[PDB]
Amino acid sequence: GISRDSRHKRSATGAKRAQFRKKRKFELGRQPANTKIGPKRIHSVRTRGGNQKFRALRVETGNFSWGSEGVSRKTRIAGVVYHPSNNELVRTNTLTKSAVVQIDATPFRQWYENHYGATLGKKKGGAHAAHAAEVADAKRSRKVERKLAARSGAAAIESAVDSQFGSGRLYAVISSRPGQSGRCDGYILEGEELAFYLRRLTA
Amino acid sequence: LTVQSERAFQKQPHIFTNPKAKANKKTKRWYKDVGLGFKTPKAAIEGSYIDKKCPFAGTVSIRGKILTGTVVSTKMHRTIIIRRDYLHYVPKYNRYEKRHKNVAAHVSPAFRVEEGDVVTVGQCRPISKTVRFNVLKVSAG
Amino acid sequence: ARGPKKHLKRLAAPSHWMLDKLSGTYAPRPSAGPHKLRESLPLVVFLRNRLKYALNGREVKAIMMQQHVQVDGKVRTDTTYPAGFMDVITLEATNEHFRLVYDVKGKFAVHRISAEEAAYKLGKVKKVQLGKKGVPYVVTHDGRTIRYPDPLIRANDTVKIDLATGKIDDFIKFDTGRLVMVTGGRNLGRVGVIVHREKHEGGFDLVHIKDALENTFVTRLSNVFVIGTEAGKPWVSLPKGKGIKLSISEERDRRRAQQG
RNA sequence: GAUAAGGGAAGUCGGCAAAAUAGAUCCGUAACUUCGGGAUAAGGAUUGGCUCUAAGGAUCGGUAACGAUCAACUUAGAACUGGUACGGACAAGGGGAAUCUGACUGUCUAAUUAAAACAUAGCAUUG
RNA sequence: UAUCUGGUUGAUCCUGCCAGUAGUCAUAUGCUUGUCUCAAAGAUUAAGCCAUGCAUGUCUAAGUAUAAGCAAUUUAUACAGUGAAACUGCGAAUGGCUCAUUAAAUCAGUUAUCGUUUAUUUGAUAGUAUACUUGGAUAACCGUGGUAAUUCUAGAGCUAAUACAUGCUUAAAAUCCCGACUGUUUGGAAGGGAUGUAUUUAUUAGAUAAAAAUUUGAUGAUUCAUAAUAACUUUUCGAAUCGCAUGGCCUUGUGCUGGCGAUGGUUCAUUCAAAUUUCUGCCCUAUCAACUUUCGAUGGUAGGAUAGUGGCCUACCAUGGUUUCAACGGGUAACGGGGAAUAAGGGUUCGAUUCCGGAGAGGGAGCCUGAGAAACGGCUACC
RNA sequence: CCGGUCCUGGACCCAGCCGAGCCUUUCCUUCUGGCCAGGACUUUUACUUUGAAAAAAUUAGAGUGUUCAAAGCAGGCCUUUGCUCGAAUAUAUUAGCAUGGAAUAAUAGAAUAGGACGUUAUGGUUCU
RNA sequence: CGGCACCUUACGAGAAAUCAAAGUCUUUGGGUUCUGGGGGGAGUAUGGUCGCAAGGCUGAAACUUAAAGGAAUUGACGGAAG
RNA sequence: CCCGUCGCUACUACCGAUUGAAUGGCUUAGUGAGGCCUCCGGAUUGGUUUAGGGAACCGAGAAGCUGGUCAAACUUGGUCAUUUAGAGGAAGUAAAAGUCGUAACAAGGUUUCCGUAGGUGAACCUGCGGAAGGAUCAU
RNA sequence: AACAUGUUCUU
Numbered sequence A: 001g002i003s004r005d006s007r008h009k010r011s012a013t014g015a016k017r018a019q020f021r022k023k024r025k026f027e028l029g030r031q032p033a034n035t036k037i038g039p040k041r042i043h044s045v046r047t048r049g050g051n052q053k054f055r056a057l058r059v060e061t062g063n064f065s066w067g068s069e070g071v072s073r074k075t076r077i078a079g080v081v082y083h084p085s086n087n088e089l090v091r092t093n094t095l096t097k098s099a100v101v102q103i104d105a106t107p108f109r110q111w112y113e114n115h116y117g118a119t120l121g122k123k124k125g126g127a128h129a130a131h132a133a134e135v136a137d138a139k140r141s142r143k144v145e146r147k148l149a150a151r152s153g154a155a156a157i158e159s160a161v162d163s164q165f166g167s168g169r170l171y172a173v174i175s176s177r178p179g180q181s182g183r184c185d186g187y188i189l190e191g192e193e194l195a196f197y198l199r200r201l202t203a
Numbered sequence B: 001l002t003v004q005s006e007r008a009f010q011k012q013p014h015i016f017t018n019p020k021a022k023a024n025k026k027t028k029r030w031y032k033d034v035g036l037g038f039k040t041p042k043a044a045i046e047g048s049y050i051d052k053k054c055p056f057a058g059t060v061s062i063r064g065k066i067l068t069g070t071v072v073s074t075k076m077h078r079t080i081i082i083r084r085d086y087l088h089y090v091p092k093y094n095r096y097e098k099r100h101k102n103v104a105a106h107v108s109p110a111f112r113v114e115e116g117d118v119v120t121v122g123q124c125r126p127i128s129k130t131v132r133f134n135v136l137k138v139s140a141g
Numbered sequence C: 001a002r003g004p005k006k007h008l009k010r011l012a013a014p015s016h017w018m019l020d021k022l023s024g025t026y027a028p029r030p031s032a033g034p035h036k037l038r039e040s041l042p043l044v045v046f047l048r049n050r051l052k053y054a055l056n057g058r059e060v061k062a063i064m065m066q067q068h069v070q071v072d073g074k075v076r077t078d079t080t081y082p083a084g085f086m087d088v089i090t091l092e093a094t095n096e097h098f099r100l101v102y103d104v105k106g107k108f109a110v111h112r113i114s115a116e117e118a119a120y121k122l123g124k125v126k127k128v129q130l131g132k133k134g135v136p137y138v139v140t141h142d143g144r145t146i147r148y149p150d151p152l153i154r155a156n157d158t159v160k161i162d163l164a165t166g167k168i169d170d171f172i173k174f175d176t177g178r179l180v181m182v183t184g185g186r187n188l189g190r191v192g193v194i195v196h197r198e199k200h201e202g203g204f205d206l207v208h209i210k211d212a213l214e215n216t217f218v219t220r221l222s223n224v225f226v227i228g229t230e231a232g233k234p235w236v237s238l239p240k241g242k243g244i245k246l247s248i249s250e251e252r253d254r255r256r257a258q259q260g
Numbered sequence D: 001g002a003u004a005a006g007g008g009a010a011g012u013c014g015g016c017a018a019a020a021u022a023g024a025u026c027c028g029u030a031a032c033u034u035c036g037g038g039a040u041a042a043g044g045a046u047u048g049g050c051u052c053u054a055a056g057g058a059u060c061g062g063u064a065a066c067g068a069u070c071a072a073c074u075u076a077g078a079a080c081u082g083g084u085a086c087g088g089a090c091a092a093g094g095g096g097a098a099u100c101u102g103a104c105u106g107u108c109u110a111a112u113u114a115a116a117a118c119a120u121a122g123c124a125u126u127g
Numbered sequence E: 001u002a003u004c005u006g007g008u009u010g011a012u013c014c015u016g017c018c019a020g021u022a023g024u025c026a027u028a029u030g031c032u033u034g035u036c037u038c039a040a041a042g043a044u045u046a047a048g049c050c051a052u053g054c055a056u057g058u059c060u061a062a063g064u065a066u067a068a069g070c071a072a073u074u075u076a077u078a079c080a081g082u083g084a085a086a087c088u089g090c091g092a093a094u095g096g097c098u099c100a101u102u103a104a105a106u107c108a109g110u111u112a113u114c115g116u117u118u119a120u121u122u123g124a125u126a127g128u129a130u131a132c133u134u135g136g137a138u139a140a141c142c143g144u145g146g147u148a149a150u151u152c153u154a155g156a157g158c159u160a161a162u163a164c165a166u167g168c169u170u171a172a173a174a175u176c177c178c179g180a181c182u183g184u185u186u187g188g189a190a191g192g193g194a195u196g197u198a199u200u201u202a203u204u205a206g207a208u209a210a211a212a213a214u215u216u217g218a219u220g221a222u223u224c225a226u227a228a229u230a231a232c233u234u235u236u237c238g239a240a241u242c243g244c245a246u247g248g249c250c251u252u253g254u255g256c257u258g259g260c261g262a263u264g265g266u267u268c269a270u271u272c273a274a275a276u277u278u279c280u281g282c283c284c285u286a287u288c289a290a291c292u293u294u295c296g297a298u299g300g301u302a303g304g305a306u307a308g309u310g311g312c313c314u315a316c317c318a319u320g321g322u323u324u325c326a327a328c329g330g331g332u333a334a335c336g337g338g339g340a341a342u343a344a345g346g347g348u349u350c351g352a353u354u355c356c357g358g359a360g361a362g363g364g365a366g367c368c369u370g371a372g373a374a375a376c377g378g379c380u381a382c383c
Numbered sequence F: 001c002c003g004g005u006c007c008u009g010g011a012c013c014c015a016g017c018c019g020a021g022c023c024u025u026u027c028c029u030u031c032u033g034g035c036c037a038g039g040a041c042u043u044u045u046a047c048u049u050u051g052a053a054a055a056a057a058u059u060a061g062a063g064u065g066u067u068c069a070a071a072g073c074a075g076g077c078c079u080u081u082g083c084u085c086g087a088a089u090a091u092a093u094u095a096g097c098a099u100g101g102a103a104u105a106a107u108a109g110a111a112u113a114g115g116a117c118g119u120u121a122u123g124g125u126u127c128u
Numbered sequence G: 001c002g003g004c005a006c007c008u009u010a011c012g013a014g015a016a017a018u019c020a021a022a023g024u025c026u027u028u029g030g031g032u033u034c035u036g037g038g039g040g041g042a043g044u045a046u047g048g049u050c051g052c053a054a055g056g057c058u059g060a061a062a063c064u065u066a067a068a069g070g071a072a073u074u075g076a077c078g079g080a081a082g
Numbered sequence H: 001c002c003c004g005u006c007g008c009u010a011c012u013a014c015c016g017a018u019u020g021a022a023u024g025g026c027u028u029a030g031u032g033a034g035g036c037c038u039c040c041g042g043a044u045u046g047g048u049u050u051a052g053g054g055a056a057c058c059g060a061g062a063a064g065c066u067g068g069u070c071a072a073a074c075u076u077g078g079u080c081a082u083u084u085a086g087a088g089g090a091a092g093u094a095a096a097a098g099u100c101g102u103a104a105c106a107a108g109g110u111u112u113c114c115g116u117a118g119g120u121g122a123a124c125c126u127g128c129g130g131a132a133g134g135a136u137c138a139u
Numbered sequence I: 001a002a003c004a005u006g007u008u009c010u011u
């Protein structure tokens, strides 16, 4: 089938090599998963040594990390907005490693509000102001108020990340390999990398 | 020479710059010592280039054989071919003939190499179709 | 070649087994076990070609099927068990004990030992590192693993192990002045004492040694088996010769002298 | 002026007449040769519609490698889609191997002969 | 034994070859052939084609026994002995044959894996926050059969497990997050969760240049080992198995208990392997001088795939890589090597073939199973 | 030569060979602990020495009345309820590794000085 | 000092003729290029290449054959000389 | 002593119309078996398990279908190599005593030979330049 | 001035 041998290629001098042996099973390849966004379907692959791989054919949700805050939650993936290696993966929403994706920003919002007491979005419309007034006037016992005070000072976050919380979708980078592990995991874009990808996107 | 000159973001793996940690609000930079007595260059440590195949600022280890040779091409992006001259002994005639081999090796942007210079290259994992060596030291041509 | 070889040709068997050429096509193939294939002596060779306790391999099978034969005290029935360096072979039915030790000529001599002696052995430290749950262990040259060793032990050190509980009795630090015994090379079977060690980073370390008679001989570090703490005191019994090489004319002189 | 099962020049002095080929892009192209050619040799593939992607500019304003405004139709690629259609009408070479003959382009028997005939450059002779 | 002799001339000295001479573990052939020890043997042409038979099977006391199989009545009305069949497990990837392909390929010595997989062996190694022990299938078997025919099998009725799927039996204190009340300059507290080990991602330990105004492993070298935090998973496994002896304790209940073992199991180590891999080294040929790069050639970034590195493959980008120190192309009556024959020395010639490495099973390709095969005494397809 | 003779034995003289160490303007790295063991630096090569290691079989070669021998790796002993020497050694090395030497043959250096030393020279700027 | 040569010798070289190099070469090594390997077939055939052509350069094999050849000696012969 | 043409015979090789023939390798294009992956499908089957008659909705799932991927093989064309038929043509070699002349060896009766160019049954002759390996080391 | 030729094979 698909093969990874180096014998079928030309030498560095440019000579066309002669056939040495028939194809060997220890040098096979297989078909790309071409993971998509949809209801979960994961197929096992029996590999060498009796080990197992997982071809994520379709995935709904991934475990994403807010690196600075030291917390990660099992959000859900909206779409693919940028791929460094091929615009055909973004145009068809194909999930591989290093794909720039938008995830649901909601669970990180809940964690922010529960572990701090402040809110994000910062937009001053009707629903945004209503939710802000609700959050600022929540019911907090004195010990939880003091532990949140011990969590104060560093409450504010970088202006680029929280600005996007108006839309309920953040920007992330896939760090797992869905075709190899069956997981579609990543981390929130932050700082210099975030500015780079925003520059690439808005353009 | 722009560091982020690709379609992807260039960074070292798992070196995180927490943008609000305490006081070191700088892009943290990792390196190693390649061992065997070889000196880590200063342009590698206080530098900004990103090279997954750098012996110092990358994830490749040096091990195996150490070779030296003369640089005959720098016409490739971040790799070189060196020329090793040697004499082959022919016992029937009790004499020698001049023989040579060409070796391709990775050259980190920490170095400034040009045709005519003598390099030392250490063996690394196969990082290309032809490359199994990596510049460690540069001398005058 | 599609998978692991299960036969060993007679001419490909290690020479230190002294296997005669014309017996037959094949040789015992030592099973996977504690020692390397080449640097071990399978039990069928030990119990047939050395002691002549059996006329052939079928009788070797019969002998070991009756719980007679033991390695390191434990009972073994694998006819091709890779018995190797420092292994202790117990034969209670005959009331006899042995220890595989390199005679100076380069082989495994038939070294008889006592029952009190046949209850311990020695082990070189391959490496020291932390396992799961941070528990430290050291790996020995016989595939034995021991947890919670002395926090000072490092590689190239010899440890004493009791053959019953698998516990470590006492050990040796590797430094100049130690009685040793070469494990490979041309200097096989000979007993020396450490003189100096030369450290080549990335290469193979070199060690300088001296026999009781003044002879300086160098050897790869990986072939050095510490056997004592000082000169003249091994931690096991030594064969007829005490591991000193004698030239061919010397041995011829001694043979004539002994025989009259 | 059209079409025709199966065959495919067996018809005929003779493939006469008809058919077949045909635009464009990409690939590939022999003998022979006066080295210029032969050559569109031969022989293959592609071509619609729709939705996109990329490239190629002008004028102003002081690492301007930038912004602002304007602007023409060419080129290349991808997804989707249909009774596999698509140079959809129109327009538009059949090809190869050789022999005789005149070098070639050119010219003549208006009204039965366009040719191998005439001319021609080149060559020679004569006054 | 470091050796020569005959042949051009009427005669001579030379060049020069032809001839003679001796070996060959070098093959054929002729003639002849009493004894013993040892011994190669369809390689060379045809990796041409093959009738027939055999070459791979496998049970211990310790997986599963209502043979309607055999023996006798026995510490055994659940069986217990011997032993077909069948299920399960393991092996069949070893061996043996051959030399067709193959010219930096194979191979040899020498390296590397800080670049990976590994049944087995041997060491270790998991108390993790209905349980006097859960279900339902099928074979074996009796029974109706169908086809000309094959190691073809269909309907129907039972019935098992170390087969298949499920599922509890449980310590001890301790840490952390959430936290209704509450003390009141910042305490306590009810009540909820996570505790192992696997999986994936992210972030922190993983330190050790010498004096003023605390614990920490290895390496030449690491993002190593190991550890922590937050989360993740079509939830990996932390034993519903088996044989012989049957002991000890009484608070005498078919009570609490406990001896050698079989088998199995996660991770690490080891061992047997494997897959890549560094450096140097191949015969003839220029009537082969340029080759490679469309459709990967040389390199960079990102991914996909792999057990894993790597143009191994894809996307974008750069224009590189080899060569008279012989590239590339062509020939080989070319598998490589250890070796063999002859041998003053230096050499010449041979090596299909007792060992090692590779490759193949008519030619090609593609796969299943399995730790391991691109297997052919396995399958699938074409010729 | 003492001669000291049981082939061989000691201080002294003689010479010969293979070596070391100091001194001669003096090469021969350099600090720390304080003749080893952890740091800071090293112009590159060829050549030659020595060594580590390098499958058996084959080769050369030591032991053995296979009755001889080719071979094989055995066998021999007062005759046992046992005892016994063995299964040598060199050859391998083009390439790689480690190592002594500095002849021979190369390579580098200070010339628009951008040169060398200042140990505990002096001042200034940075880091840890 | 450089050059074109010559005469004698023969230590030396050589099969000899002869040679001041054709010496310093079995007492065999200063550096380096080219060419030959018995006689023919044959500088032929074929492929390539240069040339307007004539040709030049490169350049085989099948097959055939016991000599061909060099230098000198004695004779014989000469439409050679004395 | 000896040269070439010519005559008889035998053997080897070469050129040659036949867009000759055959065999083996590589390859564009066209078609394309089969497996693997993927995609739906849903004969059949047990119930995430629950319904007065059973109506939901769980699980397992064969054939087949979509799109890929590896790609045997066939046709066509191309190219490379190796054998090989062929009218006729032109050589070479061998083979006691065939024909024609006599080119060379002596000043070989025109000294011989080299290169080149013409001519001629054949050896060969002639022109131009060269050599002595000359028949002159010399006036 | 002219002057061409000499079957084969040896002892």
Ligand SMILES: CN[C@@H]1[C@@H](O)[C@@H](O[C@@H]2[C@@H](O)[C@H](O[C@H]3O[C@H]([C@@H](C)O)[C@@H](O)[C@H](O)[C@H]3N)[C@@H](N)C[C@H]2N)OC[C@]1(C)O
Pocket: H005
């Ligand atoms: C018409 N010219 C011719 C020329 O063709 C050639 O002639 C050859 C001639 O040499 C050949 O002759 C060949 O073969 C013959 C045969 C008897 O063996 C012998 O004379 C000899 O071996 C050999 N020369 C002959 N067989 C053909 C002619 N055309 O040479 C001579 C010539 C007169 O010039």
Ligand SMILES: CN[C@@H]1[C@@H](O)[C@@H](O[C@@H]2[C@@H](O)[C@H](O[C@H]3O[C@H]([C@@H](C)O)[C@@H](O)[C@H](O)[C@H]3N)[C@@H](N)C[C@H]2N)OC[C@]1(C)O
Pocket: H003, H004, H008, H095, H098
């Ligand atoms: C010396 N030149 C000669 C020329 O003279 C000629 O010679 C023939 C020769 O060939 C004849 O001889 C030939 O023919 C005869 C027979 C077949 O006739 C054969 O037996 C003989 O072996 C063969 N050589 C011979 N008999 C007469 C000479 N003149 O042959 C041609 C030639 C070679 O050019």
